[PDB]
């Protein structure tokens, strides 16, 4: 049995993909999510979609509740996490449209609790360190890829995001830097919710949208909240179809190997006394 | 009508430089500013002038609150913001004494709010996400670089701020690092500083004086707050000269299109439900 | 007279070390330290050790009071610090077991106070700004080389820690980023130990050990808290032999000027009224 976890980013959080629905406002030991989980089906495949930033957009990504957003998650049953981000491109064949199913990261963030093993909860005891080699399910990912390309889109097979603190976009050095560092695309939102799901256990991936191309490449238009909505306006449909279509071949294929290594991982990162 | 913010930095913060000073200690949605503003004149210029680390340098770089610094400028009907900032040169050419109008940053700060749209306030309502792809205003940039010419200072006419957390100084691995990633001068204070401006709708410029080479080159005096200050005694009668003698040149021509544009620019980055 | 404080990192925070042992708890300006202050002798040298993490290893990295470790050290009378830390290796050429008398450091903390001298206490006043381009006692770290080829240990006499703030551990991505900005070696804790030591006139040295390769080098034992604790319970004889046999040497040689010279660079760092 799968249940899926979906996070939607900007533009990208739409309760009508969800056949079936039922809100459910829920609390965890770290706090209220960003908004109700909306419980549904695709096809025969449970799932809970979650919006980021809340439905109406109002929580900026540092003020995210990653914590919470993920335990809800988990405590739901989700065995998986797909989730949106829309992305400036720092690559010239990173077109905007183009989906990257990313595999790696580079945080530049700072203001985060990266862990529920804080020493301040009962429900998470320990010191937790928790390995990031390889932070995206590659199983969920190959299917996020392929089912891509069955829809025929621009989708990248891999991709390293550097995630900053924002909210502020980058000014030019930093994205020439970033360049430099190998990163392809740009966001403010993965880390740490890409390092709570493997915490929790979970199988996570990312469909992230590139929407720009931030501020390094001459003769485009200029990252600006208008230009990524509107990028968004014109292909979140892509985003939809390849979780509607996804959903159902993961819940199609077996998983409980690559669930019981996930846990076994996340377990044996914590020490306790 | 202009009106000239004047944020003064290390050993660079002199009331005296304002004809008919008056002090006004003012309060704002995010707390005290730094010390009383100064109100005041250069030639037929309203400027308003505040110590960025209080007048007797009490307050270290982490702990200056930049957004009721520019929240205070804002409110007193500034236009233009023009600071000064001591700072390590990471370029041979960029020697102590000489300034730098720095047109980019590199962020290595951790601590600070970069937005006056952290969800808490009244006054700043929504999600704001600035762009950062020109963060200094061009236009007050080239007054600046046209009246150290017409004086005849040391000026370099662009330059990458690395802003620091501080308040320690840097490692040499650190130093040698900053220069791989194409900084070109080093200090704690410029970032979220010129952030607030421009969510402000303030054009914003920073007078930079180098005043050490850091730790990454030989043969050279190792900074220290002794030879910072050292330094900033031989030195500061320039960017007094430069503010005094620029001033006027600002107050002389129009800035309507420029600053409708950026309050465009500003008010375009918010995002309400 | 000499006095040693020795901070015990993961595997590496053994009472057994000091003879004439007696448990001290004590409180400080900044809160109570990680565990009780261990007081004993190496030879006739007075050390005071305590353990980083806690004795049973329960508290994080970036919950550590680095502030209040450094200060009870202080305050007990310490004129020397040093302290094993382990770490990932980021070089072919740094194995697994071998020590590294690091030199240098590249700080990607982001949780952390780094100074006494925050504006908030009667017994730090002032803005202080202390160097950092030689972090580490050259002195001390010297004994340090010394005795480790004595004992016929593999030893690198320098290396560059890039310390990032966990709990979790690197991903690929910055793993690699980290070897091209010239990083040797991967931790959570140098930073910002060695900076407040620095502010309290401490010869400060670490005996950082590697434990495994992060997740950069192909076929390598991916590090997981497993890993690590495995490598230090082969290989922690090796840091406690080094403790043993280098404590006795600094006891038996002149620290009156280093001393002096530290306490001149910390006194002039800070900046009064
Ligand atoms: C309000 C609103 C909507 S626009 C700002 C969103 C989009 N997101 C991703 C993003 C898209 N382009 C980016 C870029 N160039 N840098 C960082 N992040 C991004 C970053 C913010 O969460
Ligand atoms: C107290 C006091 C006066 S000296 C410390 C000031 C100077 N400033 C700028 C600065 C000058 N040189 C620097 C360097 N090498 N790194 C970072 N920042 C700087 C950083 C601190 O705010
Ligand atoms: C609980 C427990 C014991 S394992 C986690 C410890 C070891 N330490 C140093 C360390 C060893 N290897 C590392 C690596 N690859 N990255 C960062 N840090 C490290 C980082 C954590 O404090
Ligand atoms: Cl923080
Ligand atoms: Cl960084």
Not at 48 to 66: C, D, E, F, W
Not at 127 to 144: D, G, S
Request: with cysteine; hydrophobic share 35%.
């Amino acid at each position: 049995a799968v249940k899926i976890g979906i996070i939607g980013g900007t533009g990208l959080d739409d309760p009508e993909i969800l056949e079936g629905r039922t809100e459910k406002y829920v609390d965890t030991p770290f706090g209220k999510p960003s908004d109700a989980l909306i419980l549904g089906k695709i096809k025969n495949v449970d799932c809970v979609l979650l919006a980021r930033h809340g439905r109406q957009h109002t929580i900026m990504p540092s003020k995210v509740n990653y914590q919470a957003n993920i335990w809800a998650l988990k405590e739901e049953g989700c065995t998986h996490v797909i989730v949106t981000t829309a992305c400036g491109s720092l690559r010239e064949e990173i077109q905007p449209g183009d989906i990257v199913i990313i595999d790696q990261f580079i945080d530049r963030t700072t203001m985060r609790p990266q862990s529920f093993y804080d020493g301040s909860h009962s429900c998470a005891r320990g010191v937790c360190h928790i390995p990031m080699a390889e932070p995206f399910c590659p199983k969920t990912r190959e299917v996020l890829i392929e089912t891509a390309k069955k829809l025929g889109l621009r989708c990248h097979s891999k991709g390293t995001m550097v995630t900053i603190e924002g909210p502020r976009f980058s000014s030019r050095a930093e994205s020439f830097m970033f360049r430099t560092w190998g990163a392809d695309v740009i966001n403010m939102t993965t880390v740490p919710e890409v390092v709570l799901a493997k915490e929790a256990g979970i199988c996570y991936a990312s469909i992230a949208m590139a929407t720009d191309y931030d501020c390094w490449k001459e003769h485009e238009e200029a990252v600006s909240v208008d230009r990524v909505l509107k990028t968004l306006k014109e292909n979140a449909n892509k985003a939809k179809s390849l979780l509607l279509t996804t959903i159902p071949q993961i819940g199609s294929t077996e998983w409980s190997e690559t669930l019981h290594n996930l846990k076994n991982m996340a377990q044996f990162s914590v020490l306790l006394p």
